[PDB]
Structure formats: C-alpha cells, structure tokens
Swiss-Prot record:
Changing residue 121 to A: Decreased binding to LDL receptor. This is Apolipoprotein E. The chain holds residues 41 to 183 of 317 of the full protein. APOE is an apolipoprotein, a protein associating with lipid particles, that mainly functions in lipoprotein-mediated lipid transport between organs via the plasma and interstitial fluids. APOE is a core component of plasma lipoproteins and is involved in their production, conversion and clearance. Apolipoproteins are amphipathic molecules that interact both with lipids of the lipoprotein particle core and the aqueous environment of the plasma. (Microbial infection) Through its interaction with HCV envelope glycoprotein E2, participates in the attachment of HCV to HSPGs and other receptors (LDLr, VLDLr, and SR-B1) on the cell surface and to the assembly, maturation and infectivity of HCV viral particles. This interaction is probably promoted via the up-regulation of cellular autophagy by the virus. The modification Phosphoserine is found at residue 107. Homotetramer. May interact with ABCA1; functionally associated with ABCA1 in the biogenesis of HDLs. May interact with APP/A4 amyloid-beta peptide; the interaction is extremely stable in vitro but its physiological significance is unclear. May interact with MAPT. May interact with MAP2. In the cerebrospinal fluid, interacts with secreted SORL1. Interacts with PMEL; this allows the loading of PMEL luminal fragment on ILVs to induce fibril nucleation. APOE exists as multiple glycosylated and sialylated glycoforms within cells and in plasma. The extent of glycosylation and sialylation are tissue and context specific. Plasma APOE undergoes desialylation and is less glycosylated and sialylated than the cellular form. Glycosylation is not required for proper expression and secretion. O-glycosylated with core 1 or possibly core 8 glycans. It is linked to Hyperlipoproteinemia 3: A disorder characterized by the accumulation of intermediate-density lipoprotein particles (IDL or broad-beta-lipoprotein) rich in cholesterol. Clinical features include xanthomas, yellowish lipid deposits in the palmar crease, or less specific on tendons and on elbows. The disorder rarely manifests before the third decade in men. In women, it is usually expressed only after the menopause. Changing residue 114 to S: In HLPP3; ApoE2 Christchurch; decreased binding to LDL receptor. The gene is APOE. It comes from Homo sapiens.
Length: 143
C-alpha cells in the first residue's frame, strides 16, 4: 500500500506486540521505550499522510470546488482523528507506567487486565478511523 499505510502498519505491528503484555513488553513499558517508539511511529504516519494528501492534490478531477473544499475539510478532520487515536493509545500506556511505578512490588495483574480491555477498545477506534480515512482518500481525487 501507500507509504502512510505502511507506517500505520508498523504502528499496528508494534501495538499488537505490546497488547500481548508479556514480560518483555512490561520491561519496555516501564522504561518508556514503548511510548517513545509509538511516538516515533505515530509522527511518521502523520508526516507521510500529510505528504500523501499534498501529492494527491496534483491529480484532481476538477469538481464544483464547493465539493473540493468540503472534501478537503473532511479529509483533514479524518487525519486529525487518526492522530488523536494514536496519541490516546500512547497516553493510556503512559498512565499504565505511572500506575505500576506507584505500587512498589505488588501484583500488576488487575492493572494489566484493565489495560488490555482498554487497548482493545482503543484499537477498535483507531481501526475504524483508519478505514474511514482510507475511503475518503480513495474518493478524494475522483471527486
């Protein structure tokens, strides 16, 4: 697929691993390497998405401009939604790190169950927003 889709796919791969919540995952969550890596992948995805929209604007089927400006507005909204979803994933993981650090050496198991359920819901949101964004891009130049 497109460059931004490949960047998002790297985000997906890393997040799927994180969602296993293994001991390797826990190590990288508590050191903040997970959230730094997710930051980098998210920024790359958004950068490539902006560049891709800009290149799509070079091959537009001219429509009522009415329609073109409205569709550009909607596409920017979808982009912002994707960025915010990825930031919500990262922030939930930051929260988990802070909670684990606050409880000395006690069991994190209940924290991990709650985190896993919340991450499944955050992934569902990010995925439906990504699919919406792909469809808006696909129809963008077609008008």
């Amino acid at each position: 697929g497109q460059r931004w889709e490949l960047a998002l796919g790297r985000f997906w791969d890393y997040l799927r691993w994180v969602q296993t919540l293994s001991e390797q995952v826990q190590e990288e969550l508590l050191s903040s390497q997970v959230t730094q890596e997710l930051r980098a992948l998210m920024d790359e995805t958004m950068k490539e998405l902006k560049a891709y929209k800009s290149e799509l604007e070079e091959q537009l089927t001219p429509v009522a401009e009415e329609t073109r400006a409205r569709l550009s507005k909607e596409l920017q909204a979808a982009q912002a939604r994707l960025g915010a979803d990825m930031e919500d994933v990262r922030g939930r993981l930051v929260q988990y790190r802070g909670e684990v650090q606050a409880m000395l050496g006690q069991s994190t198991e209940e924290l991990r169950v709650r985190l896993a359920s919340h991450l499944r819901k955050l992934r569902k949101r990010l995925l439906r927003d990504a699919d919406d964004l792909q469809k808006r891009l696909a129809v963008y130049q077609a008008g």
